[PDB]
């Protein structure tokens, strides 16, 4: 695990973190590889690594969603490592966060999850919280299960389940 200081994202895709090319080379990471991230409070996340030409060697660019998921702020430190084992998921189960789906919400798959996931090959982990903007509503979801467990890539054959009671915040 290489340690890196958390910096702001330029690429706003939730699945993406960015490193300098020299840091990618040092870690033997290739553009598009899955990486495992460790943050505070024993939190983990899986992301896709890309290079960024303005990124300092000792830093990682990550968006607010990934920061929140790792319980880190700008300027905090995370660890990174390659996560090459991650397979295509058979199925995943995600549930919305109650306070983002109070009152009437359209079908979560159609409005949020399908556009979010479609052709993105997003790595996800059990326990992640992610945010989808469905114009102009933002719904947050929690990953309650993956198969395989506890992480997978959400691919064309992956079956996405989102039925159940909304999750309570905190």
């Amino acid at each position: 695990p290489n340690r890196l200081i958390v910096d702001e994202a330029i690429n706003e895709d939730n699945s993406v973190v960015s490193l300098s090319q020299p840091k990618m080379d040092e870690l033997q990471l290739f553009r598009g590889d899955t990486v495992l991230l460790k943050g505070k409070k024993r939190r983990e996340a899986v992301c896709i690594v890309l290079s960024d030409d303005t990124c300092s060697d000792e830093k990682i660019r990550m968006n607010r969603v990934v920061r929140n998921n790792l319980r880190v702020r700008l300027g905090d430190v995370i660890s990174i490592q390659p996560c090459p084992d991650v397979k295509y998921g058979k199925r995943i189960h995600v549930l919305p966060i109650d306070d983002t789906v109070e009152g009437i919400t359209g079908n979560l798959f159609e409005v949020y999850l399908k556009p979010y996931f479609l052709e993105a090959y997003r790595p996800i982990r059990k326990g992640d919280i992610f945010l989808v903007r469905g114009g102009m509503r933002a719904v947050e979801f929690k990953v309650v299960e993956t198969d395989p467990s506890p992480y997978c890539i959400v691919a064309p054959d992956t079956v996405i389940h989102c039925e159940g009671e909304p999750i309570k915040r905190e």
Binding site: F109, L118, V144, E145, D157, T158, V159, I160, H161, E163
Partner: peptide
Amino acid sequence: RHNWGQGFRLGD
């Protein structure tokens, strides 16, 4: 244990 319910195949 866990209730998966029913789901949608993402597709491409």
